[PDB]
Design a protein around this nucleic acid. Structure first.
Lengths: 54, 117, 109, 142, 101, 154
RNA sequence: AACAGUGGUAGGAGAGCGUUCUAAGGGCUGUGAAGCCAGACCGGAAGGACUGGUGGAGCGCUUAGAAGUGAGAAUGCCGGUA
RNA sequence: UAUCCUUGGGAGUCAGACUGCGAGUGAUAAGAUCCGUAGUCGAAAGGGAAACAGCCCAGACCGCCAGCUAAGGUCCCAAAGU
RNA sequence: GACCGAUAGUGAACCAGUACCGUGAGGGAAAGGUGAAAAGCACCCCGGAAGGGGAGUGAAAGAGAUCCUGAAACCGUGUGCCUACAAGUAGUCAGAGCCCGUUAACGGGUGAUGGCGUGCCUUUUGUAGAAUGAACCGGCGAGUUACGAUCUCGUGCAAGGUU
């Protein structure tokens, strides 16, 4: 499969419309106050669901 | 002595690229597609300067034909009777201010029913 | 306003421009939190350039870190390095190791 | 210099009875009314026409043997076949479609000819729902 | 208003205007008069067949000039024919006063 | 030219017209290493006029100075000290504020050693005058014994 | 001043624009030269000025003369980049 | 009406194509092949034949938002007679 | 020197017959410029460092080490006008609406909609062609010179003209 002719400039700008990556799902940690991903252990204090995992 | 060739090619190409502002895509940046588009634009502009005066006359006839059929008669019987018999000599462009002054067009259209009887 | 540049970090610019689209326009409080939780290879490099501009702002012009916002954020490209990868029947293909310049401008809100 | 009109046009509504007319000697007058050729302010690119309501669409008539041998064809884009309707079975079942197929071929092709087709309303019978627009009565051949 | 016939073409003119016509042989500050004033209109409609009789239009010359440049290019494909030219087309700009029908 | 550039004797890359153009040397004129097509060559530029034209040309530029009042016939023009300080006062006494041309009878040494540093003046001998030197100098200073030496030859 | 004329390939004839260097006189620049970047100016064409930004040391005009004198194409050569 | 001849300098060209009218050749068959005669393309744009090298009308120095006509046309697309 | 000026002039302006290629004979490159003077950035801040932001030197740091000027392809970030019922060698003529203010001119930028419109070169009797060429940009790249022959024009002298 060899290309007939080269791709235009706006035809490759349109193809990368759905190529973006999206913001993570993050909430605030109730202990330290930093942000952290939902349903995951905070990587700063080490606490999940009130208790401590350290 | 040696004439190497400096800053004349750049000026001669930048003139052609400044005539091509507004064109789509590669036709306003690259030299050898902008050159062909400027050549076609010259040919097209000549041909369309003749077709412009072809086209405004067929615009004027279409409005005189519509303001004449309000009274009683078509364009073909208004002109034969206006320009020929009742020898008045207004023409298609200025007899088409039936748009603005329609109560002065009817004077000219009543002075042409008198000749057709 | 304050600014910070990176100048020839070793990452291709089309990959580093995906992460720069997330933090453009936001406040520097949550832009640091977005970059800590994104699993890409460009985000520990962008985070140091971002944190180095806040420190320029609050030390050289005496602003406050609570009232800052990201004004400008763009990735330019730097010089590339050309290497040679060996292929079948002696083709000797060429690999481009591309670099980039990362600039962040932070101003008052 | 000539005056062109743009956002100063004034449309008006007209009712045209199709009681005893020929299919093609009605469509020409209607397709010249919709385009706007009966006005001294006609400009070829701004749609100066008027709105047309056609009542009594099922009472049209064709002259000669055209009720049987005039055939309305219909093709899909590559199914391997086409479909066929008779002009008599088109007049009693879809009378408002044979007056739109006729007028659609006498209008220009392009964006204006698809935009100025939107001013035609064809009804079977003798009642139309547009009384708030206060339509007038227009008689053919001038 | 009146309708005059000056430069091979006809112009619907009215008092106080400023029109651009083909080049007349007068200089700036002069006063031109037009004699062929077929169809003076308004409220005293006079449909003259040619040239309503005894009526003129008076005007004074504001400027003599040349218009903006046009370039004519005109090539022929595959035969190596090309021809550039430039054009400017002079005019006379007058202002109108006292249509005396 | 194409056969003097160093190297380039064999077919460049195995003589392959595969996806590239057929070349025969790396010193062809359209390559980069060299080969100049025509260029310059060492040659001479002089020619010869007929001998009567050679005399008419000197008579014209000499008779075109007596019209414009740019000729100054001196008497002896003798110096003894050979200084440049006093030759620039002789030319001030005769009002020569520009280029000049001094023609002597036959090889005077004190007036040629002097007036050698003055940037306008040029000293020459009586059989050393020519066209491009008389036209170029705007004011001719000849002596009494030099017009007798010029008029016998011409 | 009248008249008459002005499509054009191969091809013949004529008038010109630009580039580098040399000779003569005449003269611009550290109060900013060449080059580069914009602009809505001028000429029948090739072309030419004038303002503003960068640049930081050379350049142009008039009349003649010499030519490594004009690039969109050669599956052209070299470099850079898609 | 304004061409013509002589002498001298410089050339390009040497498989032409189609249409109408007269003849061979083929099967009086191809948009085949070869002669005589006129035209148009070649080297010719513009209007008509829906589109169309060679058919019909007509030969572009440039500008105009002026007028009269040729071939072909006047219900609507689409200028002009329902 | 009416010779070149870093794709030029030697293959080589620079540790060049070097690096590379070949068993060997042999072939054979690319690569110049801070500033007048190193006065070539003490000290502080972010960073593991690289790299930055200040402060200093300097006429200039947007002269900070492939450091004079720095074009085009190519890649981006902001914004004024248009764009999700449309069939397009992408322009040209007609034209509203919106946004600006010029080498002041019948000004500049975008353009909903309408008419017309089968790239450039080459070669052929004939091309839009499933005929050939070109990915794009920049540089380089083709009727000269010497000696004879012949014709026109110019100059000098002329039944003598030139060495």
């Amino acid at each position: 499969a060899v290309p007939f002719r080269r791709t235009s400039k706006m035809k490759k700008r349109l193809r990368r419309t759905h190529f973006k990556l999206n913001v993570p799902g993050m909430t605030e940690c109730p202990s330290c106050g930093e942000m952290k991903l939902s349903h995951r252990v905070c990587k700063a204090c080490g606490s999940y669901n009130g208790k401590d995992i350290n | 002595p040696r004439v190497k060739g400096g800053t004349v090619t750049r000026k001669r190409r930048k003139k052609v690229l400044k005539l091509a502002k507004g064109y789509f895509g590669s036709k306003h940046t690259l030299y050898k597609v902008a050159n062909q588009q400027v050549m076609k634009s010259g040919n097209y502009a000549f041909r369309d300067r003749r077709q412009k005066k072809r086209d405004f006359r067929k615009l004027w006839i279409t409005r005189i034909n519509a303001a004449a059929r309000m009274n009683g008669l078509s364009y073909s019987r208004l002109m034969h009777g206006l320009k020929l018999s009742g020898i008045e000599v207004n023409r298609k462009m200025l007899a088409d201010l039936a748009v603005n002054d329609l109560t002065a067009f009817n004077q000219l259209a009543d002075a042409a029913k008198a000749q057709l009887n | 306003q304050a600014k910070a540049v990176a100048r020839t970090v070793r990452i291709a610019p089309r990959k580093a421009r995906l992460v720069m689209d997330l933090i453009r326009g936001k406040q520097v409080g949550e832009a640091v939190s977005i970059l800590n939780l994104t699993p890409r290879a460009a985000s520990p490099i962008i985070e140091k350039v971002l944190k180095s501009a806040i420190a320029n702002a609050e030390h050289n012009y005496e602003m406050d870190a609570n009232n800052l916002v990201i004004s400008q954020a763009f990735v330019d490209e730097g010089p590339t390095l050309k290497r040679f990868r060996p292929r079948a029947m002696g083709r000797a293909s060429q690999i481009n190791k591309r670099t980039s310049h990362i600039t962040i401008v932070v101003s008052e809100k | 210099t000539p005056m062109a009109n743009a956002s100063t046009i004034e449309r008006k509504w007209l009712v045209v009875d199709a009681a005893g007319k020929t299919l093609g000697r009605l469509s020409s007058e209607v397709a010249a009314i919709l385009r706007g050729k009966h006005k001294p302010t006609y400009t070829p690119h701004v749609d100066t026409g008027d709105h047309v309501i056609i009542i009594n669409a099922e009472k049209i008539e064709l002259t000669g043997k055209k009720l049987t041998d005039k055939i309305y064809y219909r093709h899909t884009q590559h199914p391997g076949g086409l479909k066929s309707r008779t002009a008599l079975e088109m007049r009693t079942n879809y009378p408002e479609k044979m007056l739109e197929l006729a007028i659609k071929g006498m209008l220009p092709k392009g964006s204006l000819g698809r935009q100025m087709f939107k001013k035609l309303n064809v009804y079977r019978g003798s009642e139309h729902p547009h009384e708030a627009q206060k339509p007038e009565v227009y008689e053919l051949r001038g | 208003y009146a309708i005059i016939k000056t430069g091979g073409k006809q112009i619907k003119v009215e008092e106080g205007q400023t029109v651009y016509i083909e080049k007349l042989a007068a200089e700036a500050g002069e006063t031109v008069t037009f004699e062929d004033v077929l169809f003076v209109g308004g409220d005293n409609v006079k449909v003259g067949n040619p040239t309503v009789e005894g009526a003129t239009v008076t005007a004074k010359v504001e400027k003599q000039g040349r218009a903006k440049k046009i370039t004519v290019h005109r090539y022929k494909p595959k035969k190596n024919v090309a021809k550039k030219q430039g054009h400017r087309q002079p005019y006379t700009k007058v202002t109108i006063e006292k249509i005396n029908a | 030219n194409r056969s003097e550039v160093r190297g380039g004797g064999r077919k460049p890359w195995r003589q392959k017209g595969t996806g590239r153009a057929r070349q025969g040397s790396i010193r062809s004129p359209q390559w980069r290493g060299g080969g100049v097509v025509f260029g310059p060559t060492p040659r001479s530029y002089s020619y010869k006029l007929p001998k009567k034209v050679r005399r008419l040309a000197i008579k014209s530029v000499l008779s075109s100075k007596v019209i414009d009042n740019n000729i100054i016939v001196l008497e002896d023009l003798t110096l003894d000290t050979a200084k440049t300080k006093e030759m620039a006062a002789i030319l001030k006494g005769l009002s020569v504020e520009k280029k000049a041309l001094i023609v002597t009878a036959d090889a005077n040494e004190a007036v040629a050693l002097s007036a050698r540093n003055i940037p306008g003046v040029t000293v020459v001998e009586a059989n050393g005058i020519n066209v491009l030197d008389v036209v170029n100098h705007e004011k001719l200073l000849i002596t009494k014994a030099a017009v007798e030496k010029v008029e016998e030859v011409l």
